[PDB]
Design a protein around this ligand. Structure first.
Ligand SMILES: Nc1nc(=O)c2ncn([C@@H]3O[C@H](COP(=O)(O)O[C@H]4[C@@H](O)[C@H](n5cnc6c(N)ncnc65)O[C@@H]4COP(=O)(O)CP(=O)(O)OP(=O)(O)O)[C@@H](O)[C@H]3O)c2[nH]1
Ligand SMILES: [Mg+2]
Ligand SMILES: [Mg+2]
Length: 384
């Protein structure tokens, strides 16, 4: 019958899918403002704690005195038991550890889709704009417990100052959720080598008006036997940025489209954003496609994703042994459900391509991406 071209459906920045997914400048700035609020408080809470440690160093303080001091700082927004732990930890530092703590100032680096520009406007109720802002502690080679308590104190002190904010503890981060604004901010915490951080910060400021060795970037884990895991988020940022330069400007677009497909097919759940990115990069690295037709390119991606996910999707961090998505012999109900929807996507896109009219084509492709694009005039007859 007829054959439709969907390039403008995907890419029109006003009415097309990109126009629906990309945050406005006002919205990006609001997330930047939120990140800055978290950073300022975290630096302030660390200074208050260091102020207490400095008093302990300057003169012998009893545990009860340290407890009272803790209780007058913004650490007061922790629970009473947690405040005791913070006081105990500060009191029990030996002279050497205390000197290291007095020298600590947290540093920050954003990771995830806010950093490499693939953050989509959320679609279904419950979905939220996500800022992943890592907090970094330069140390040699100071306790895991203390560092987690102080970041928790910072986040809880902000929650105590804002109606509708909620703190959530997760295995790999602290989170502040702002449900009414469809926004949350995740704060993973890292330990990094102090000597190397300093040396490279100096070098960086000298070249202006290097990167930390990935092996020593340690992500704090909240529960279990392992308190730390080596996981440098910049590995993913660098791998994705290089992939964009290598594959082209359309990579960021089709990764957004696959994430939006995911958001439309599951209110919560579905394949991780990073697993979609990795599979998509693999396909586009190994299959001929045409960037001037993202409708065609999306068809090619959809055809190949099931097999990518079936063989298992490995992390761009080769030091990470966990797959982003397990191979099919390891699939349980959750993975089988993801395979099912992945297998459906090509069928949906095919149905759209051979619809009898523009409005029918729009309806069919919106089975994949939701009723977000409404302008059927973005869909046009394919050229002879
Ligand atoms: N360095 C690092 N290593 C870890 O192993 C890791 N796992 C989680 N985190 C960060 O913790 C915060 C909470 O994460 P989630 O509970 O939401 O789950 C993560 C992980 O399942 C997975 N993921 C993230 N980073 C890695 C990854 N380096 N290697 C393997 N898997 C990883 O993906 C989930 C989503 O994380 P992001 O929000 O960062 C990915 P995105 O591009 O921003 O996607 P979007 O939000 O737009 O949907 C959070 O801050 C994590 O980044 C990690 N950070
Ligand atoms: Mg994220
Ligand atoms: Mg997050």
């Amino acid at each position: 019958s007829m054959t439709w071209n969907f390039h403008q459906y995907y890419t029109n920045r006003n009415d097309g899918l990109m126009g629906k997914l990309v945050l406005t400048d006002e919205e990006k700035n609001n997330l930047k403002a939120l990140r800055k609020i978290i950073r300022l408080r975290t630096r302030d809470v660390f200074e208050e704690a260091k102020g207490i440690a400095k008093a302990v160093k300057k003169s012998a303080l009893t545990f009860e005195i340290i407890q009272e001091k803790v209780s007058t700082t913004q650490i007061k927004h922790l629970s009473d038991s947690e405040q005791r732990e913070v006081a105990k930890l500060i009191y029990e530092m030996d002279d050497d550890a205390r000197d290291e703590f007095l020298g600590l100032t947290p540093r920050f680096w954003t990771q995830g889709s806010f950093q490499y520009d693939t953050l989509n406007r959320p679609f279904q109720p419950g979905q939220e704009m996500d800022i992943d802002d890592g907090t970094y502690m330069p140390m040699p080679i100071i306790g895991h417990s203390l560092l987690i308590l102080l970041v928790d104190a910072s986040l809880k002190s902000l929650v105590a100052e804002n109606h509708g904010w909620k703190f959530e503890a997760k295995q790999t981060c602290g989170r502040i959720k702002i449900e009414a604004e469809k926004t949350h901010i995740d704060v993973p915490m890292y330990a990094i080598p102090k000597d190397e951080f300093q040396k490279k910060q100096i070098a960086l400021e000298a070249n202006r008006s290097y990167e930390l060795d990935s092996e020593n970037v340690n992500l704090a884990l909240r529960e279990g036997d392992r308190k730390w895991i080596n996981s440098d988020p910049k590995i993913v940022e660098d791998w994705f940025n290089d992939s964009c330069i290598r594959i082209g400007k359309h990579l960021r677009k089709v990764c957004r489209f696959m994430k939006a497909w995911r958001d439309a097919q599951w209110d919560v759940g579905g394949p991780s954003s990073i697993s979609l990115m990795a599979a998509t990069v693999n396909i586009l690295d190994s299959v001929a496609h045409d960037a001037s037709d993202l409708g065609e390119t999306m068809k090619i991606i959809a055809k190949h994703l099931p097999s990518e996910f079936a063989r298992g999707v490995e992390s761009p961090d080769s030091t990470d042994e966990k797959p982003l998505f397990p191979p099919s012999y390891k699939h349980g109900p959750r993975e089988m459900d993801i395979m099912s929807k992945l297998e459906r996507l090509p069928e949906i896109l095919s149905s759209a391509e051979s619809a009898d009219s523009k409005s029918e084509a729009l309806k069919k492709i919106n089975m994949a991406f939701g009723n977000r694009v409404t302008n059927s005039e973005l869909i046009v007859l394919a050229k002879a």
